[PDB]
Amino acid sequence: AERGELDLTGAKQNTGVWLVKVPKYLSQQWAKASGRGEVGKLRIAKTQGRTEVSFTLNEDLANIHDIGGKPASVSAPREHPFVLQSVGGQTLTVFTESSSDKLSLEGIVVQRAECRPA
């Protein structure tokens, strides 16, 4: 591991990651997390030739509001559906640059998606 070298373990280990487009208000809500830093759950439900992916905030973040206080029922945490997209026509890899200047290939993007507002 010398200066200027790119650590390759990740890529050749074929470690996979997801690349997701997230609405600004949702990522802003994620910033309000505390403790362990949990924000919610990612759900993947498969039926016959059909897959539904979504993200739902946890109880803590579902109850922190902006100037408004939410309206009707205050029901249950809202499901944010994912719109799955293709990655086949391109090779996307992730590389990190640490505070110590170390560069490393962490993994390959195996799935792309866009998280839609609820």
Next chain:
Amino acid sequence: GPSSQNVTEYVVRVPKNTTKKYNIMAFNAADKVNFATWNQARLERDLSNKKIYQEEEMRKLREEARRKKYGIVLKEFRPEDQPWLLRVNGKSGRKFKGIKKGGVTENTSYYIFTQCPDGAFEAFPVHNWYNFTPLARHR
């Protein structure tokens, strides 16, 4: 909806603690990049433009001053927007130049979701997105 379904669920954490910045390194399918062939690689900022001079333009009737005056400038060096140079497998291997993608923001941004040992996903914002192509395509 469906009477039966197979479900997988994951806790998601979004760390604030991160001594690492996550970036995207993208290759065009046409260049057929295969990591199995990578034995070693270097990734360094290309500072070649640092010492490259460019001509910048600086009473008479305007229609009498067709010939403008020029000087030369040594631009402000922002190591951040300098391209990356990726060199694979020594001096005889492939070389790519990395250029930052700039169709900048709207009301969304990209995150990388990576799985952790405990099974949860951790999401990190993408810092920068680079398109990498063979050095030979650059002039």
